[PDB]
């Protein structure tokens, strides 16, 4: 009838113990321990008669002055043992002063065993038939109690003494009377009643009852339920629209929803975020499932499941392939990332393999002194930065002293949202302010709001951004070669022209870009040629068009190609397909073995 209380851990003083005063059920465990100053008088007027059931375990350790539990927990009927203490549902250990257990209403221990050890005054143990309470007593550990010696004068008879009193059951060959105290017998029901319990007259409780009832064969008159509890009734399964909770009660959607909702921080033992699965309200989705967000319902994963990675102290610095690997498989980062990558090989691919699945970062993202990076595109799936935590100065995205960074993301394809915080950009010499300005637009770090410490003089200062266009004046294919010519480049003061750079890769269709799979330093994504500046040969007809002969090409192969002027103008990406077979020559080879 009363409250459902959470598990408790009561130590030192009895003060917090009164928090149990209205509980009918403890949904968790109950530990009472280390009370060295307590005396019998402290327990004489202390009682919790409302407590019927504990879902996990009961543990009592070093509680001084306590001589019996008959007044503390007179009505405790079931210990379910859903969670156990080292396989035990009941632990009584070093209870100096305990003379008897006296749990005279304890009918069933649903799961787990009993450990009663080193209780120097403890008697009324030989008088308990545990086979009535637990299915297997084989794992019980009841040793080093007063009962082990020749000093227990256990006496059950009191009313008439030895004439029609406690029920007696056999140990091996000896019949023993069965009681909890001098004034309380152990309840024993007919075998037909099984674990359901019976009334004082021996009439069976209903099959949905567990241990005891106030009336026979009525599922609304149970002291406790065998299966589930709902609206003063014991039920086999929870009916619609209810869900099975903590393996003992029926709850509605709204209850499950309230538990779930936003236990702000405390991910590490103080949240779970409850979900719905197979008509159960449970702590988390089982393996192979993920949580559909709008209705708390676990649904099977489309391929591999999303993975939340909680960072130690809310941050992690990635300075190597090895540290990046520690985040492999993550789809959500709870915390903030600091990127500090100075060197290595095949970084764009390696970083994309380990970090390419991250869709969200709850804190901030900081890129600093990452000398090796040319792009942040390896963060392939990153769509959200929440800024729930920020870098000092209230920054959610911060880029400082990245000497080769030319691209953030390709803003023609990528969408990134930044909920809170500002942007910081300083000492990114190869990064054009247009890319930064595009990012502000895309991310919603909107210009109607507050600032972003963005340097005008130290972002892009060592880059000329796209500017002029070089055009191809000549193109020639061979099955193995490509010969190209293109416009000569002349800056304002035409003086000291030094270098062109030709890029070519084997390409399929369309999907080719300059800032592709970070060329960085080492393993490259582009085949590159340095083309010496031409010789003008006067003013009238000075187009001695720089060119190049590509050799070592596969036949019938499409090549992405483009030219650039050494750090003015770049040509557009042209696709050139090497020659293949003449129709005539496909025919021959077919038509003649």
């Amino acid at each position: 009838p009363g409250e459902v209380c959470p598990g408790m851990d009561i130590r030192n003083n009895l003060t917090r113990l009164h928090e149990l005063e209205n509980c009918s059920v403890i949904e968790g465990h109950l530990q009472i321990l280390l009370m060295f100053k307590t005396r019998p008088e402290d327990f004489r007027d202390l009682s919790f008669p409302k407590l019927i059931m504990i879902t996990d375990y009961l543990l009592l350790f070093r509680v001084y002055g306590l001589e019996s539990l008959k007044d503390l927990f007179p009505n405790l009927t079931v210990i379910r043992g859903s969670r156990l203490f080292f396989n035990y549902a009941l632990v009584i250990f070093e209870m100096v002063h305990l003379k008897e257990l006296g749990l005279y209403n304890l009918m069933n221990i649903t799961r787990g065993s009993v450990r009663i050890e080193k209780n120097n005054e403890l008697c009324y143990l030989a008088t308990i038939d545990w086979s009535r309470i637990l299915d297997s007593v084989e794992d019980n550990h009841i040793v080093l109690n007063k009962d082990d010696n020749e000093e227990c004068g256990d006496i059950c008879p009191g009313t008439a003494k030895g004439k029609t009193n406690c029920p007696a059951t056999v140990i091996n060959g000896q019949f023993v009377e069965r009681c909890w105290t001098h004034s309380h017998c152990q309840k024993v029901c007919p075998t037909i009643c099984k674990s359901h319990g019976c009334t004082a007259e021996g009439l069976c409780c209903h099959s949905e009852c567990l241990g005891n009832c106030s009336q026979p064969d009525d599922p609304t008159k149970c002291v406790a339920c065998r299966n589930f509890y709902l609206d003063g009734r014991c039920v086999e399964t929870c009916p619609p629209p209810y869900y099975h909770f903590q393996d003992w009660r029926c709850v509605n959607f709204s209850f499950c929803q309230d538990l779930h909702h936003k236990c702000k921080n405390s991910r590490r033992q103080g949240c779970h975020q409850y979900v719905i699965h197979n008509n159960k309200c449970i702590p988390e989705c089982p393996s192979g499932y993920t949580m559909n967000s709008s209705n708390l319902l676990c649904t099977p994963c489309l391929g591999p499941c999303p993975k939340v990675c909680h960072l130690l102290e809310g941050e992690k610095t990635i300075d190597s392939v090895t540290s990046a690997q520690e985040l492999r498989g993550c789809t959500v980062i709870n915390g903030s990332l600091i990127i500090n990558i100075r060197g290595g090989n095949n970084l764009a691919a390696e970083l994309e393999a380990n970090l390419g699945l991250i869709e969200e970062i709850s804190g901030y993202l900081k890129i600093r002194r990452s000398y090796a990076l040319v792009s942040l595109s390896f963060f392939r799936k990153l769509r959200l930065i929440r800024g729930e935590t920020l870098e000092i100065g209230n920054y959610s995205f911060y880029a400082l002293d990245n000497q080769n960074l030319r691209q953030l993301w390709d803003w023609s394809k990528h969408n990134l949202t930044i909920t809170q915080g500002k942007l910081f950009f300083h000492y990114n010499p190869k990064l054009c302010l247009s890319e930064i300005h595009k990012m502000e637009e895309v991310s919603g770090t909107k210009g109607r709001q507050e600032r972003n410490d963005i340097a005008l003089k130290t972002n892009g200062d060592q880059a000329s951004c796209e500017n002029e266009l070089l055009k191809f004046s000549y193109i020639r294919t061979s099955f193995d070669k490509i010969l190209l010519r293109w416009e000569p480049y002349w800056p304002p003061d035409f003086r000291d022209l030094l270098g062109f750079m030709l890029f070519y890769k084997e390409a399929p269709y369309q999907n080719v870009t300059e800032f592709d799979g970070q060329d960085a330093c080492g393993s490259n994504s582009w085949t590159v040629v340095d083309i010496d500046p031409p010789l003008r040969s006067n003013d009238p007809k000075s187009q001695n068009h720089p060119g190049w002969l590509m050799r070592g090409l596969k036949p019938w192969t499409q090549y992405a190609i483009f030219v650039k002027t050494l750090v003015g103008a770049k040509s557009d990406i042209i696709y050139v397909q090497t020659d293949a077979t003449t129709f005539e020559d496909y025919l021959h080879n077919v038509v003649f073995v």
Binding site: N12, L34, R62, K118
Partner: peptide
């Protein structure tokens, strides 16, 4: 030195709560 049931005792010598 320190062990078993004594740790608990050792601790309350020092605790005295």
């Amino acid at each position: 030195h320190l062990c078993g049931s004594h740790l608990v005792e050792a601790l309350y010598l020092v605790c005295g709560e």
